[PDB]
């Protein structure tokens, strides 16, 4: 288990993979990954994020964000008081170590900065939005909470769940989510 990807090629593999289990495709085996539906679920998408780095030989960070935070898709808004998505180290061309968040549910089109990333949780043509906090985890982490208390979901049992309620839905409703509490570890 490698906690550096190798170079951007292999990044972009990584990318690719992940986008290909995204919900709407005809490449995603089950459960995909619910990236069309922002309104909640981010974890369990995130947690699924880092399953595949995982087959792949790699792990990763996750980075949580904590605020009044506001997100578009282009033609709804939600808003969150948390959000996370994986934090990825890779070596780029001269052998130096570089971070991207991975995080299609914002950025279809591939890994970005984690500033660009927190600044899109904070969009303004959703009304007002800041970030109180932000901290890195290790990828095993699920969720953190603003004291930094950890949970996990070790066997994927939650997240896979999730995302499975989660499967049909797509925009910014229903919202609230539907229940997920029935869904174990
Ligand atoms: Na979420």
Known sequence: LASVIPDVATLNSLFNQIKNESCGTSTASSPCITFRYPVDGCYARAHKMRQILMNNGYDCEKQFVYGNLKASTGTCCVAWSYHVAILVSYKNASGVTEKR???????????VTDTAWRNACVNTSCGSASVSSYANTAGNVYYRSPSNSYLYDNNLINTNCVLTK?????????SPAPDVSSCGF
């Open 101 to 111: 968040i991975i995080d299609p549910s914002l950025f279809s089109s591939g890994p």
């Open 166 to 174: 989660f499967s049909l839905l797509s925009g910014c409703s229903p």
